[PDB]
Amino acid sequence: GLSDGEWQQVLNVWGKVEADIAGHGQEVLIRLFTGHPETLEKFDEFKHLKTEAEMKASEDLKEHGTVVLTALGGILKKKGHHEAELKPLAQSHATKHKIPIKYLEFISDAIIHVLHSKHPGDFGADAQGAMTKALELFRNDIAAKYKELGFQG
Numbered sequence: 680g681l682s683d684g685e686w687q688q689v690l691n692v693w694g695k696v697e698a699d700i701a702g703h704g705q706e707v708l709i710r711l712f713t714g715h716p717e718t719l720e721k722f723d724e725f726k727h728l729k730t731e732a733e734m735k736a737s738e739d740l741k742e743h744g745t746v747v748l749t750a751l752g753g754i755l756k757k758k759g760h761h762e763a764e765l766k767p768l769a770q771s772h773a774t775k776h777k778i779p780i781k782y783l784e785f786i787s788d789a790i791i792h793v794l795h796s797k798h799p800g801d802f803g804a805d806a807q808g809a810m811t812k813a814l815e816l817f818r819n820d821i822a823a824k825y826k827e828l829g830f831q832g
């Protein structure tokens with residue numbers, strides 16, 4: 680878990696994302712999809728968008744990026760008290776979408792990349808530490824539910 684000073688840093692960095700969640704969201708998905716093409720195949724609506732310029736030209740992708748980051752924002756503001764919010768997500772991603780925990784690792788790394796790409800020199804070493812912890816926590820609680828369900832990979 681995190682200290683309160685650590686949570687205040689992640690909510691301070693999240694205020695930068697909130698200035699434009701769709702712009703941040705589309706960059707995160709693109710990072711993900713271009714870096715790990717196997718992840719795009721899980722998306723029936725977007726698997727035909729194989730290159731960055733195709734991805735960029737779809738408002739449907741940008742809206743999906745908005746759904747993702749708005750969900751995550753909600754969870755971060757719970758400061759770790761997020762069992763009611765994470766359970767549904769865990770369930771759907773394991774039993775419906777069949778998303779291995781490794782893809783959650785990929786998106787967590789994608790977020791960090793995009794914060795440094797969109798705010799160079801503005802994402803401090805301390806901020807990076809706190810954000811990393813918050814994403815690990817998120818991932819580790821989802822891993823716990825995955826084990827319960829025996830979602831093997």
Ligand code: HEM
Nearest residue numbers: 718721722724746747750751768771772776778782783786
């Ligand atoms: C920060 C991590 C993520 C969050 C907050 C998130 C959130 C969401 C939400 C809120 C939905 C809609 C409701 C649902 O079906 O639960 C959804 C759907 C979905 N997610 Fe995620 N997700 C995340 C990561 C991922 C990753 C890493 C993948 C795959 C590589 C993935 C694949 C999907 C798919 C395929 C759908 C259904 C798509 C559709 O409606 O067209 N998710 N996700």
